[PDB]
Amino acid sequence: MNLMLALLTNFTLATLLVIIAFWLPQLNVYSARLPFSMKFFLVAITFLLFDLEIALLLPLPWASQTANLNTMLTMALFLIILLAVSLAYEWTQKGLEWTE
Amino acid sequence: MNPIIFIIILLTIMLGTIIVMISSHWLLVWIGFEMNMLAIIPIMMKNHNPRATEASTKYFLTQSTASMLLMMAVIINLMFSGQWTVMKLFNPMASMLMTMALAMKLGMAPFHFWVPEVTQGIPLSSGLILLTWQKLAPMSVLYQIFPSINLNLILTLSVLSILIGGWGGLNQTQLRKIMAYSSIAHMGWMTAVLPYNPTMTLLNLIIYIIMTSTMFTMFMANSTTTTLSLSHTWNKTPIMTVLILATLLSMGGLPPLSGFMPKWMIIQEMTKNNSIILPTFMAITALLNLYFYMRLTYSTTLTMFPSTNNMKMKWQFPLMKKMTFLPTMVVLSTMMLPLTPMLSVLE
Amino acid sequence: EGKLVNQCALEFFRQIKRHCAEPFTEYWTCIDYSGLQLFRRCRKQQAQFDECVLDKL
Amino acid sequence: PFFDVQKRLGVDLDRWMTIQSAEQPHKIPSRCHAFEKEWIECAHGIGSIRAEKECKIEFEDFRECLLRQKTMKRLHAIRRQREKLIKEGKYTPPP
Amino acid sequence: MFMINILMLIIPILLAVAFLTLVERKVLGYMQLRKGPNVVGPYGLLQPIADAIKLFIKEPLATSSASMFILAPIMALGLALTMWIPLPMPYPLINMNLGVLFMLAMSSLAVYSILWSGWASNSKYALIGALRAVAQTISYEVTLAIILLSVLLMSGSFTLSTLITTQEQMWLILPAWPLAMMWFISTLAETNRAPFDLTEGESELAGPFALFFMAEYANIIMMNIFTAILFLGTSHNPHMPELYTINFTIKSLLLTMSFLWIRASYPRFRYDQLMHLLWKNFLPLTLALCMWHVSLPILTSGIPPQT
Amino acid sequence: MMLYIVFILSVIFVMGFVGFSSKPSPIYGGLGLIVSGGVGCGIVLNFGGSFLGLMVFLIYLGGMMVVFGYTTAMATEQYPEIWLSNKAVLGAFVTGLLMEFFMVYYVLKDKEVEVVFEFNGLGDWVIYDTGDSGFFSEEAMGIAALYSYGTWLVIVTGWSLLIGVVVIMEITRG
Amino acid sequence: AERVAAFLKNVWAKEPVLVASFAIAGLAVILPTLSPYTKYSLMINRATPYNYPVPLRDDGNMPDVPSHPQDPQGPSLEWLKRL
Amino acid sequence: MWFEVLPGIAVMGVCLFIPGMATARIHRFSNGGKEKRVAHYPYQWYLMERDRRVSGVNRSYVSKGLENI
Amino acid sequence: SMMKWNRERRRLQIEDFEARIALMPLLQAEKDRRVLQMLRENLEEEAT
Amino acid sequence: MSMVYMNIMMAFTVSLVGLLMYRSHLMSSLLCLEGMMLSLFVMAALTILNSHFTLASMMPIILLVFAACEAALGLSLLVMVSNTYGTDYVQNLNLLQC
Numbered sequence A: 001m002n003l004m005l006a007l008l009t010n011f012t013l014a015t016l017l018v019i020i021a022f023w024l025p026q027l028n029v030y031s032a033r034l035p036f037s038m039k040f041f042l043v044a045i046t047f048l049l050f051d052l053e054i055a056l057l058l059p060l061p062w063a064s065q066t067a068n069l070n071t072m073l074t075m076a077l078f079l080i081i082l083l084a085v086s087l088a089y090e091w092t093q094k095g096l097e098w099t100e
Numbered sequence B: 001m002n003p004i005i006f007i008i009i010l011l012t013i014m015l016g017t018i019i020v021m022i023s024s025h026w027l028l029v030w031i032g033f034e035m036n037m038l039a040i041i042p043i044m045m046k047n048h049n050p051r052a053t054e055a056s057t058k059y060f061l062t063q064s065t066a067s068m069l070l071m072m073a074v075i076i077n078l079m080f081s082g083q084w085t086v087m088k089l090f091n092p093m094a095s096m097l098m099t100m101a102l103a104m105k106l107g108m109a110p111f112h113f114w115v116p117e118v119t120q121g122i123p124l125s126s127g128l129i130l131l132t133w134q135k136l137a138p139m140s141v142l143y144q145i146f147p148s149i150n151l152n153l154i155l156t157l158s159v160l161s162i163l164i165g166g167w168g169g170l171n172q173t174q175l176r177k178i179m180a181y182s183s184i185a186h187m188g189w190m191t192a193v194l195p196y197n198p199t200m201t202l203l204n205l206i207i208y209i210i211m212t213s214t215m216f217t218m219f220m221a222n223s224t225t226t227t228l229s230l231s232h233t234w235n236k237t238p239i240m241t242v243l244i245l246a247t248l249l250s251m252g253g254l255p256p257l258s259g260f261m262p263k264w265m266i267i268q269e270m271t272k273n274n275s276i277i278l279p280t281f282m283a284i285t286a287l288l289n290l291y292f293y294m295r296l297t298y299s300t301t302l303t304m305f306p307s308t309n310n311m312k313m314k315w316q317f318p319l320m321k322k323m324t325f326l327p328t329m330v331v332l333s334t335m336m337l338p339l340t341p342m343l344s345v346l347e
Numbered sequence C: 001e002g003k004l005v006n007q008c009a010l011e012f013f014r015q016i017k018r019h020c021a022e023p024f025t026e027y028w029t030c031i032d033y034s035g036l037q038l039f040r041r042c043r044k045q046q047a048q049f050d051e052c053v054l055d056k057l
Numbered sequence D: 001p002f003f004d005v006q007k008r009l010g011v012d013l014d015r016w017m018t019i020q021s022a023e024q025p026h027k028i029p030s031r032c033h034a035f036e037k038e039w040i041e042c043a044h045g046i047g048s049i050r051a052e053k054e055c056k057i058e059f060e061d062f063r064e065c066l067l068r069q070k071t072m073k074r075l076h077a078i079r080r081q082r083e084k085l086i087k088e089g090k091y092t093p094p095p
Numbered sequence E: 001m002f003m004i005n006i007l008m009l010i011i012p013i014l015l016a017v018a019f020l021t022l023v024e025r026k027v028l029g030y031m032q033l034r035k036g037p038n039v040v041g042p043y044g045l046l047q048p049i050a051d052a053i054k055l056f057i058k059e060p061l062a063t064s065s066a067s068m069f070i071l072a073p074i075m076a077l078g079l080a081l082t083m084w085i086p087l088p089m090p091y092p093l094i095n096m097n098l099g100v101l102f103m104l105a106m107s108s109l110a111v112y113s114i115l116w117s118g119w120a121s122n123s124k125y126a127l128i129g130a131l132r133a134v135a136q137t138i139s140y141e142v143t144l145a146i147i148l149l150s151v152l153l154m155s156g157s158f159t160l161s162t163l164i165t166t167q168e169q170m171w172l173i174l175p176a177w178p179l180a181m182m183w184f185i186s187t188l189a190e191t192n193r194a195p196f197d198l199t200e201g202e203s204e205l206a207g208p209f210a211l212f213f214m215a216e217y218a219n220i221i222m223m224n225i226f227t228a229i230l231f232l233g234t235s236h237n238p239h240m241p242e243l244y245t246i247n248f249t250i251k252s253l254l255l256t257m258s259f260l261w262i263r264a265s266y267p268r269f270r271y272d273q274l275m276h277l278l279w280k281n282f283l284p285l286t287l288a289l290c291m292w293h294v295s296l297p298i299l300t301s302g303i304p305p306q307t
Numbered sequence F: 001m002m003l004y005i006v007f008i009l010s011v012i013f014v015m016g017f018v019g020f021s022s023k024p025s026p027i028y029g030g031l032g033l034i035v036s037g038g039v040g041c042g043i044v045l046n047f048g049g050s051f052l053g054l055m056v057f058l059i060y061l062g063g064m065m066v067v068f069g070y071t072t073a074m075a076t077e078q079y080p081e082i083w084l085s086n087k088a089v090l091g092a093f094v095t096g097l098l099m100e101f102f103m104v105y106y107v108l109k110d111k112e113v114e115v116v117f118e119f120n121g122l123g124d125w126v127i128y129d130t131g132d133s134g135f136f137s138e139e140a141m142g143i144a145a146l147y148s149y150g151t152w153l154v155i156v157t158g159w160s161l162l163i164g165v166v167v168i169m170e171i172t173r174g
Numbered sequence G: 001a002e003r004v005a006a007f008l009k010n011v012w013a014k015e016p017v018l019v020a021s022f023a024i025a026g027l028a029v030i031l032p033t034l035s036p037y038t039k040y041s042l043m044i045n046r047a048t049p050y051n052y053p054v055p056l057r058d059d060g061n062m063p064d065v066p067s068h069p070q071d072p073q074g075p076s077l078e079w080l081k082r083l
Numbered sequence H: 001m002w003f004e005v006l007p008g009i010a011v012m013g014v015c016l017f018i019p020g021m022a023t024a025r026i027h028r029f030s031n032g033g034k035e036k037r038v039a040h041y042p043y044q045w046y047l048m049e050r051d052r053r054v055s056g057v058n059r060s061y062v063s064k065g066l067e068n069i
Numbered sequence I: 001s002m003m004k005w006n007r008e009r010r011r012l013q014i015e016d017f018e019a020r021i022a023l024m025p026l027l028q029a030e031k032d033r034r035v036l037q038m039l040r041e042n043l044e045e046e047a048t
Numbered sequence J: 001m002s003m004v005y006m007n008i009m010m011a012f013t014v015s016l017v018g019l020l021m022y023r024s025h026l027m028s029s030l031l032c033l034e035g036m037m038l039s040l041f042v043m044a045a046l047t048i049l050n051s052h053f054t055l056a057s058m059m060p061i062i063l064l065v066f067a068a069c070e071a072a073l074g075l076s077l078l079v080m081v082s083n084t085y086g087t088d089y090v091q092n093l094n095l096l097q098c
């Protein structure tokens, strides 16, 4: 209940601050493609794919508690190396360049 | 495409299929389809044109929808049995959803509309993969879940595909669309016999793949995508016209050629189960396919169509395309009937 | 068997009360203050209780 | 599997997650572990055609543990009857 | 009782933000051989109040979609306050078992306020500026998440108060100063602070404005509080919790003041150059250090406890 | 009552789905999916899925849906059409909204309902597990097991993500 | 070898960030196999008792199984205390 | 001079001291003068709920010792 | 320094976990009776 | 079944009907596809959590990861379509009619 109360308070207050911010006494009586750039799209997609790999690494602090450490360490490094290979491929294919 | 990347993408297409075929867990089956679909899109797009982009998008939407329905069937199956083992499903609603999902992936009627359009819009080599290798993974799942499949649903899908495939091919002059509708009809034979003898499904699938690969390879050797273009073959590679004639008659199911064998054995298995009306209806309906196979033979081999003057320039250069395995594939496509009892290896 | 578990525990705590009531009370009050009830925050008091039970029991 | 490579090589690629009564981290059992175990052991090795008929009792019990339909229905009945009697003042519940 | 506690967090956060604007102006001023605000109240102590009143009685000067024009500042300010509720100082308002993940999850939502306000700007050029800002923010989210995971492999859990225990004997900045360096820079880039203040840079080449400003400056304080806990752990004495709060406040103030110090010291990055700093420099090192910090506890037998 | 919190969240879940499924401007459709994602996390949280719930926020909302909105602003819609101004969208939205309310009314009135299939209506709390006193999170133990039991899952998943990078660079090079 | 050192000096001059990344990543892969302490990580994890140690029914032929926690038989953690 | 920057820093520091100091004192007030009980895992929640029943007043932070034996 | 402290933290966790193991039989004995008492109480009301 | 399954199953059906009844924007149909995934994630998580199927706790994450990768591919196709015609309208993807 406490977290729900905290969230409701934070955003309820934010709503109220926006309210009075827009309405105070004034005292007066009188879908195309946005110049599409492919490079910014690939940044977003690259972030997504790296974000999914981060999702796979987040369990690592718990995984280190296993007795199967031989398997666990090998798979942890394997995942990170494959992430590095992804970066290396994008790098060498000019995917990190902002010219042209 | 970089040649090394093309190899790795081809291997990923194969790996996704292999994962589906070796998995005992439903999640891994789903992963195999996801990986396979991811790797095939780049070879649909490789020639970079609006038609190839439309085909890749139409393909993506169909396969993604089918994979969502498959995951639904898996999750419903988990709820009602508490396990993921790849086998019979434990809930009739799950069975219908998986059957419909796999029918969509195979392009069976009435989920067939994408097959002619996607095949037309991609290169011949990509269409070769689409209409042969891609049938392996869904058919291997159907091989394992068939005990729980609704008999009326599967036989209705089969009958519709044989009719739609047969009728759809009659109106085609594009070779890729002829192969697409031919593929739809042949899928119907494969699923019609599956409830009775899955072994005969495997036999039909293997032979279909062999003849389909032969035809695509022969189209690729001459860069022919239309009937009229194929009609110039006699004035360039006369041997090729004879091979095309023999292969088409085999795909028509004419004895004594290899393509008679799957239809012959499916009719046997269905009659052993007192199914007489259905096999007879299927065999007569397959005459539609024979008609538009015969039409191609008339314009390719049994008559000489008009030529062009610039064709003479082609007489001075040899075929340099790989035509890999073509001599073996054509002989298997036509001359295998005397070895029919060898089907027991598939048992 | 569950009832015997209860009887053994009650007799266990009756022996602490008889002999080491005061050192034990200081010890578990020290534990009770911590939000995680940590042993490592109470080593002095644990030592007094440990020495009392060893001496008298 | 269509090709049972796992059994041929003895490698466990995905069998470990197929059923809930398999080995779990820190021996954490599933809620229906005993029902799954009984059903699996009843049906083992006889084939699904036979098991559908001969292991129906174990499977019906297992499905009850999984989705708890009969239990919820029975509770629905007792609660519905209790509301009726209280609405008629014929029943007072204890503390 | 709990509602009082929430307000004893919300109100001081907004007051701290107000007076950070004064501290920033005066610290920058003295580094520039001048004074900064010193007329509006003694030593400028009423300057934030005058600025706040002024902005709120200013004319509130068409949106392309009213719902998103109002959503963007509510999201920004609401999310910013939410990031504070799991912070242990030393006791959190909400004690989350996965508090670190919660902060990571909530911070990833903050980019929607940028996106929504760009959509509501009704201007092609403001939408493009918003998309450039979003690309920067998500780029530096990558290293922040990986750096955080690397540190937690020494702490053992996603609970923020466990970082206190992990640093009972020693600050984590000593075993992890290479990560501390990239973490600190990543926070600057994440908050669009100089030399990564490209939204205000590239742009020039009332109440609603104030609300976005409060959200950003609350995030700046919060990020430096997070940095203090992550790398400069203060010792907690359960019988004298105020001792922790004093020491931990001083560290957070100094870290915040170093944000101002850095603004005063360097020119701005080009957009492509700050992208290369991330994708070609920080990310390679972060990946290598993530592998290293996975291996290190195992190879030293220094794996922390799960609990 | 708070005892029906999961059901109430599930009701909101459906309305958000009717929101974007009637397909207004993709700007608003994206908003409807974000609200459903947050509500979907809340449902998962109340079943003990703390880590799973936060992954929806971190990955589904903070990653995938951010990229969806980024792409929408860049290649689909830059200015949203007024919500429900289209007749089909308004009709589809109203049609789905009424179906949900009729479902919710009956299940709450009778504490059960048959919408094609039979659903109990006593509250999802009734099926919960009655014994739990372990010193760990079972969800965390299961997820952590990916690195000990799920070697094969890691290999195929990691490979697919690498091919995702390779494939997308091929697709977009044109 | 000399060609190896010349290559390393070149990258050290032009790309020290990448050189450091690869060196750190190489140490992470290699050092666990060379470390005498890696074996204790396995032992400490196994020694942490998450669930209850269910006792065995005594059949009279288990001289290696302790009867009481403070009896000498059974695993000892003395190696862990001194660590 | 630079030390005229301090008054603004002092106000900021007092504003950031209040949340932590308020939470700690509110916890003691609400939990019988002790730290608020942490229950991140089912075992700790089980003990806290058992404490509530044993307390006799429905307060998990009211402790009973050997006086109840 | 981190290796030494984390090793001590592992020893402190084991001691905490062993305290739980000592108490588990008593808690299990109580949980059984509480569950059976509740089921028995639910049974009296069903009969009525 | 439990009461929650009604609405979660309904949500999938709503998004499935949304996906099968296209309008104009291809993006709108992609959102329905990701809505389907979301309802699948929630239903799978609920089943796995409630049954205490410990090792299956990772399955919703795998589903999320692969489905996000599929969505990334779909978004790439959408931008390529948008580059060709200037909109993501599905009525433009009708060349293969003939």
Ligand SMILES: CCCCCCCCCCCCO[C@@H]1O[C@H](CO)[C@@H](O[C@H]2O[C@H](CO)[C@@H](O)[C@H](O)[C@H]2O)[C@H](O)[C@H]1O
Binding pocket: A068, A069, A070, A073, A074, A077, A078, A081, A082, E298, G029, G030, G032, G033, G034, G038, G039, G042
């Ligand atoms: C592109 C693919 C990249 C894949 C990269 C994979 C890299 C893997 C490198 C290290 C893998 C093994 O790493 C480490 O090796 C030593 C070898 O003594 C193992 O052995 C060590 O730990 C085990 C515990 O399991 C002890 O029994 C043993 O006495 C000890 O020496 C470790 O258990 C293992 O953690």
Ligand SMILES: CCCCCCCCCCCCO[C@@H]1O[C@H](CO)[C@@H](O[C@H]2O[C@H](CO)[C@@H](O)[C@H](O)[C@H]2O)[C@H](O)[C@H]1O
Binding pocket: A068, A071, B015, D010, D011, D012, D013, D016, D023, F148, F149, F151, F152, F155
């Ligand atoms: C296309 C990619 C080609 C590369 C193919 C690589 C295949 C790699 C297969 C990895 C799995 C190998 O086989 C499997 O390995 C792990 C350890 O490693 C073992 O798993 C072991 O650890 C966990 C923890 O309990 C459990 O699964 C089990 O208790 C134990 O056996 C399996 O018992 C073994 O069957």
Ligand SMILES: CCCCCCCCCCCCO[C@@H]1O[C@H](CO)[C@@H](O[C@H]2O[C@H](CO)[C@@H](O)[C@H](O)[C@H]2O)[C@H](O)[C@H]1O
Binding pocket: A025, A026, A027, A028, E052, E053, E056, E057, E058, E059, E060
């Ligand atoms: C943070 C709490 C602060 C509490 C302060 C409470 C004070 C309430 C009295 C506010 C008086 C504001 O005074 C008024 O503000 C509005 C702001 O647009 C100004 O502007 C207004 O008037 C001008 C013409 O004069 C109009 O063209 C304009 O559209 C209108 O906005 C006025 O020129 C100013 O006279």
Ligand SMILES: CCCCCCCCCCCCO[C@@H]1O[C@H](CO)[C@@H](O[C@H]2O[C@H](CO)[C@@H](O)[C@H](O)[C@H]2O)[C@H](O)[C@H]1O
Binding pocket: B076, B091, B092, B093, F117, F118, J009, J012, J013, J016
């Ligand atoms: C194409 C639609 C796509 C959207 C799909 C929407 C989700 C569908 C959810 C299906 C889950 C319900 O599935 C259904 O549940 C009931 C509950 O007992 C089962 O049970 C029902 O039929 C069997 C018949 O022997 C008996 O149990 C009983 O008569 C009846 O209760 C059904 O056998 C099962 O098919």
Ligand SMILES: N=C(N)NC(=N)NCCc1ccc(I)c(Cl)c1
Binding pocket: E018, E019, E020, E021, E022, E024, E025, E047, E048, E049, E051, E052, E055, E210, E213, E214
């Ligand atoms: N960037 C600075 N430090 N100076 C500055 N002019 N800040 C903006 C001024 C401001 C905005 C909102 C509020 I509420 C307050 Cl009180 C003050």
